[PDB]
């Protein structure tokens, strides 16, 4: 009616900013005092993977910790054997402008998408001996930016038209939709048991969704600019986000607010990706000045650098058993560190 | 060798994937790639016919040279997230309508787009080809519709020669890296097939200055 934007809606945001302050009695970086540091952490390039001809944009590990897939702007999708650095499959894509890839947990399927607005599914196990397309999922209106399997039949996608969506692979229809954001959604990450997931958008916020219902549960607001990457903590009760203002942050789901900020005065470039190591004591982030820093997560001291690359570090990932770390870059190489 | 019989036949499979990868990266380096931009009102659609959801490609061979043109205006997202995918095209083509000067908010809408792409940090080394379409409809509109409705400072003749010539310097002054980039202006006819003959001549100029700068001989 009259003035209704004023009184009621801007009041409930003043009830939330005062309830988060009624539970923040102490800060993380005080109680994490008088514990041992982790000391310097040098690692070394164990493998190097050659064969792409253009920039590499995405990568994802298989669940056995030995195979992996990668995508690049030359229209190829390669599956690698990382112990003996052999190529297992090479897949040609219809279009060349690809921005994400994922591996099915069973190991039977892989997914792909980009500036064509489609998510393509590929069957790896056939009676004929080659890899053929199995499904195409249409309906988004902007470029696809991320996707993740839940099992052999379900998959979630985030899109540049400000929306996320849940799909059914038997048919080709999206069964649920997710709307609240007001900018382009850039990334998403699934809970360890796959009941919840989070996403971050260019409106500088992150959201917690429920999968079976389809409703937002919490919103988080700390950054000054866009959010590029996001990841869950192994416990399942915190997550970290990396933004375009050269900072990372830690959020707590049950305290409902922020715990730490990971920054430094000599670092003034954006962040492309982020990941946690097993047990969650280290936070790896890969930045836009060609490096990859390693942070102590409880304390806020940076505890290492790994500087083998020659151009922008676009993606990284840590394996399930915790053995190695991979990075892809805009010079077309992949490297395994340990 | 310490490898098994099956370990050796997996190495041989891999070296034959390696050979089809090289065969594909050589057959794709024989084509020039071009991004097509411009605040889209009229001209951009006819120049494709002149040469014959997400992203739109097109092919055409002319005189032993193969091209791929990319139209991108059908996206409607934040342009500052995906535009860096096009780092490393050979050139950019840019379309403008000369018949949008006194309709002057629109002519200054094009000068707003030409200023942001020409000064990106991703396109520091990329030259620009520039078009100016609809040179018929601009013939008489200078007569009935005088200028200074599009540019207040222009205090000179409405003779249609200083007019088109004055619109030109207003764009090329927008180039702020006079050393690492050139502009190539041309006035599109729409009946002659000289349109594709100009794109050929400018593109073979862009490549020789790249080679001569790769060996240090510049």
């Amino acid at each position, epitope marked *: 009616e009259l003035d209704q934007l004023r009184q009621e809606a801007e009041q409930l945001k003043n009830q939330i900013r005062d309830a988060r302050k009624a539970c923040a009695d102490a800060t993380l970086s005080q109680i994490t005092n008088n514990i041992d540091p982790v000391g310097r952490i040098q690692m070394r390039t164990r493998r190097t993977l050659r064969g792409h001809l253009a920039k590499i944009y995405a990568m994802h590990w298989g669940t056995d910790s030995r*195979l992996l897939v990668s995508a690049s702007q030359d229209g190829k999708l390669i599956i690698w054997d990382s112990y003996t650095t*052999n190529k297992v499959h090479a897949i040609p894509l219809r279009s060349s402008w690809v921005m994400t890839c994922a591996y099915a947990p069973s190991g039977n399927y892989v997914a792909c998408g980009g500036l064509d607005n489609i998510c393509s599914i590929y069957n790896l196990k056939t009676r004929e*001996g*080659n890899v053929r397309v199995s499904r195409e999922l249409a309906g988004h209106t902007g470029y696809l930016s991320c996707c993740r399997f839940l099992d052999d039949n379900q998959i979630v996608t985030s899109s540049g038209d400000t929306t996320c969506a849940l799909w059914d692979i038997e048919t080709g229809q999206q069964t649920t939709t997710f709307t609240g954001h007001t900018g382009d959604v850039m990334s998403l990450s699934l809970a360890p048991d796959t009941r919840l997931f989070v996403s971050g958008a260019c409106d500088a916020s992150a959201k917690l969704w429920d999968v079976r219902e389809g409703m937002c549960r919490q919103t988080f607001t700390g950054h000054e600019s866009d959010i590029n990457a996001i990841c869950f903590f192994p416990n399942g009760n915190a997550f970290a986000t990396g933004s375009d203002d050269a900072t990372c942050r830690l959020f707590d789901l049950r305290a409902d607010q922020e715990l730490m900020t990971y920054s430094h005065d000599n670092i003034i470039c954006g962040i492309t990706s982020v990941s946690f190591s097993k047990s969650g004591r280290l936070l790896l982030a890969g930045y836009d000045d060609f490096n990859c820093n390693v942070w102590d997560a409880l304390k806020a001291d940076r505890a290492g650098v790994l500087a083998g690359h020659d151009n922008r570090v676009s993606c990284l990932g840590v394996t399930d058993d915790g053995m190695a770390v991979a990075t892809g870059s805009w010079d077309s190489f992949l490297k395994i560190w340990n | 060798c310490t490898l*098994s019989a*099956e*370990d050796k*036949a*997996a190495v*041989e499979r891999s070296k034959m994937i390696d050979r089809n990868l090289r065969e594909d990266g050589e057959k794709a380096a024989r084509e020039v790639k071009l991004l097509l931009l411009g605040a889209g009102e009229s001209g951009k659609s006819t120049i494709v016919k002149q040469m014959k959801t997400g992203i739109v490609e097109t092919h055409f061979t002319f005189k032993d040279l193969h091209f791929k043109m990319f139209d991108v205006g059908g996206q409607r997202s934040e342009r500052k997230k995906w535009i860096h995918c096009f780092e490393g095209v050979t050139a950019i083509i840019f379309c403008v309508a000369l018949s949008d000067y006194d309709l002057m908010n629109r002519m200054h809408e094009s000068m707003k787009l030409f200023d942001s792409i020409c000064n990106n940090k991703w396109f520091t080394d990329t030259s620009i080809i520039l078009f100016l379409n609809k040179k018929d409809l601009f013939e008489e509109k200078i007569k009935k519709s005088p200028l200074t409705i599009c540019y207040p400072e222009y205090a000179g003749s409405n003779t249609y020669e200083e007019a088109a010539a004055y619109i030109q310097c207003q764009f090329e002054d927008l180039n702020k890296r006079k050393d690492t980039k050139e502009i190539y202006t041309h006035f599109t006819c729409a009946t002659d097939t000289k349109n594709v003959q100009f794109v050929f001549d400018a593109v073979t100029d862009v490549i020789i200055k790249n080679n001569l700068k790769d060996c240090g001989l510049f």
Partner: single-chain antibody, 232 residues
Framework: VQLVESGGGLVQPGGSRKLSCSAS????????MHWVRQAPEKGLEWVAYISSGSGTIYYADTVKGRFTISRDDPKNTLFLQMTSLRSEDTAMYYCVRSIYYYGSSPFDFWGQGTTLTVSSSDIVMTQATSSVPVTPGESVSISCRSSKSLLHSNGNTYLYWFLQRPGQSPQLLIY???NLASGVPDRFSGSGSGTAFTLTISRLEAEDVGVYYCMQHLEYPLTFGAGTKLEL
């Protein structure tokens, strides 16, 4: 998927024939190929191998300078030229397809066979049973023994199990070891270590009747074991 071979017939000692096989239903150029032979009333014997891309070829010492194997990809066909045939070459000849990468299953599809009747350092595999009678629903075991250990330093042991029913071609049951081929009931299983292996069937149906073979794939030449029949 099917493989159909032709040629064969009757030949005098010293003549020559030419065999072929027609592939249909799969990506022929991606698979390596084998020829395997079986004389009247005895077991299986490996003959020759040509890899995908024609870059590698191996032969068995019995037929080394007398036979030649080749392939024609755009036609999808496989050849075997024979010269100076002797009476030890009477047999039925099969055609087998196999692909090699991390996690694949070699030796999975076998042809129907063609007969040729001519007129008138190696690992040894020993399986010492024959004609063991059993009733349905019972538990039966089989074993063969190697003269060298098949466990390689990378972790794998290379032992396979095939099955041949009266009137048909062999089928695969277990690859490298304890791995079950697709389309096979779960009541089979394979176990062992080093130089002693075993194949177990839990409770039989009326179609698990025939002879059973074992094979090493640790190094060329490839060698089979003799057969272990099962009569009900």
């Amino acid at each position: 998927v099917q493989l159909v071979e032709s040629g064969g017939g009757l030949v005098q000692p010293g003549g020559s024939r030419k065999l072929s096989c027609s592939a249909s239903g799969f990506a022929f150029s991606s698979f390596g190929m084998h020829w395997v032979r079986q004389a009247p009333e005895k077991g299986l014997e490996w003959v020759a191998y040509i890899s995908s891309g024609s870059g590698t070829i191996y032969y068995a010492d019995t037929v080394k300078g007398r036979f030649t194997i080749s392939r024609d990809d755009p036609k999808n066909t496989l050849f075997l030229q024979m010269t100076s045939l002797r009476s030890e070459d009477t047999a039925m000849y099969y055609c087998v397809r196999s692909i090699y990468y991390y996690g694949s299953s070699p030796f999975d599809f076998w042809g129907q066979g063609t007969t040729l009747t001519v007129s008138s350092s190696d690992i040894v595999m020993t399986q010492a049973t024959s004609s063991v009678p059993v009733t349905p629903g019972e538990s039966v075991s089989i074993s063969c023994r190697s003269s060298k250990s098949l466990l390689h330093s990378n972790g794998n042991t290379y032992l396979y199990w095939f099955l041949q029913r009266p009137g048909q071609s062999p089928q695969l049951l277990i690859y490298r070891m304890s791995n079950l081929a697709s389309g096979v009931p779960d009541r089979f299983s394979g176990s062992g270590s080093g130089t002693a292996f075993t194949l177990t069937i839990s409770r039989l149906e009326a179609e698990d009747v025939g002879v059973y073979y074992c094979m090493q794939h640790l190094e060329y030449p490839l060698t089979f074991g003799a057969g272990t029949k099962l009569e009900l």
